[PDB]
Amino acid sequence: SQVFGVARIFASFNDTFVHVTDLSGRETIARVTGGMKVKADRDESSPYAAMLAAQDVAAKCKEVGITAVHIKIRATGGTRSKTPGPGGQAALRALARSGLRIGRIEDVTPVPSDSTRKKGGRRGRRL
C-alpha cells in the first residue's frame, strides 16, 4: 500500500538539502535546498528556509505519487564537522507536518576511518 522513498537530508552548516529518491537511489523525486527557497545568502541553513524546502519536496512527492519516506541524514562529513546542521531537524519536522509518512530513520554521515588531512593547518582557523 505505502509507496516509499528515501528522504536524504544533507544538513551541512551554511545549507540544507532535502533529496527524496527511490530505494535503489538512482531515480530522484525532488532535490529541494535551503538556498533555493530563501534568497539571502546567509539564510540557507537557517531553519525556516529548510522547512520551506522540505514542504516543497513533500509537495513534489505528492504530485508524483509517493506516500512514505526513509529519513537518511548526512552531515558534511570527513574533512568537515560530522555534526548535523541547524536545519536537518527543522526539515524533518516540516516533513512530519506535511503528512508524508516516515519509516526507518538513520544518520549516514560518512564518518571515516582515519581521515585524509583536515582544514586549517596545524595552528587551525584563527578568527
Binding site: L23, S24, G25, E27, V64, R104, E106, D107, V108
Partner: protein, 214 residues
C-alpha cells in the same frame, strides 16, 4: 524544456526468497526507447534496504541488505544480496569505552566464483562480579580470537555455494559459533557479522538465479 516526469515507467523490486518477502518495493526508470534500452539500464541497481523490512520482526532492525538487480523479467526485477550491512547508529552504540573490540575481516572464494569479504565485530565482556572497571583482553588473546574467527569464516563461507551462506548469516548462527569458539580464550559480548562485501562474479548464471525464485 522537456520534463521527463510524464515520460516514466514504474517497476517493482523483487527480493530473493531467503527472507520472508520476495518483494521490496517500487523503483522506476525511463522507457525502453531506441538506442538506449531499459532492461540494460536496470541490470546493475543496488537497493539498500532494512532487514526488518524483509523479515518483519524488529530483531533484524539492527541490519541492512544491499540488493543488486540482475535479471529484468516482465516488469518485475530480480535482485541478489550484493551486500549485507549495519547502519552506523547500531555498531556506534556497541563501541563503548572501557572494553576492547575485536574486528575480523575474511576474504573467501565460495563454491561459485564469488569472492566474499565477510567481517566480524566482537566486543570483550564486563564479566559478572567484575570490579576492574576495564575488561581488556590481552593483545595475544585478541589475536587468537581474531584467528579463530577467521578460521570459522573459512569453514562456513567457501562451503555451501554462497546462497546458503546468506541464509546462515541471517539468524546469527555464525556469530553464535564464533562466540562458542572464543569462550575458552575470553568471554565476549555481542559478536556480529556487521558487513558483507563482494569482489568477483562470473557470467550472470541466469538459470541458477531463477532457481532462487520459485
Amino acid at each position: 524544456v522537456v520534463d521527463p516526469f510524464t515520460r516514466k515507467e514504474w517497476y517493482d523490486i523483487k527480493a530473493p526468497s531467503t527472507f520472508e518477502n520476495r518483494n521490496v518495493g517500487k523503483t522506476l526508470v525511463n522507457k525502453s526507447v531506441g538506442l538506449k534500452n531499459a532492461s540494460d539500464s536496470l541490470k546493475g541497481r543496488v537497493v539498500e534496504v532494512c532487514l526488518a523490512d524483509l523479515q518483519g520482526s524488529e530483531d533484524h532492525s539492527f541490519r541492512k541488505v544491499k540488493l543488486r538487480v540482475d535479471e529484468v523479467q516482465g516488469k518485475n526485477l530480480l535482485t541478489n544480496f550484493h551486500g549485507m550491512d549495519f547502519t552506523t547508529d547500531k555498531l556506534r552504540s556497541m563501541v563503548r569505552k572501557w572494553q576492547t573490540l575485536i574486528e575480523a575481516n575474511v576474504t573467501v572464494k565460495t563454491s561459485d566464483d564469488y569472492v566474499l569479504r565477510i567481517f566480524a565485530i566482537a566486543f570483550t565482556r564486563k564479566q559478572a562480579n567484575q570490579v576492574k572497571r576495564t575488561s581488556y583482553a590481552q593483545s595475544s588473546h585478541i589475536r587468537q580470537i581474531r584467528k579463530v574467527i577467521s578460521e570459522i569464516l573459512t569453514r562456513e563461507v567457501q562451503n555451501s555455494t554462497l546462497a546458503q551462506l546468506t541464509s546462515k548469516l541471517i539468524p546469527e548462527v555464525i556469530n553464535k559459533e564464533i562466540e562458542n569458539a572464543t569462550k575458552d580464550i575470553f568471554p565476549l559480548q555481542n559478536v556480529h557479522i556487521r558487513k558483507v562485501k563482494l569482489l568477483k562474479q562470473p557470467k550472470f548464471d541466469l538459470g541458477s538465479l531463477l532457481s532462487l525464485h520459485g
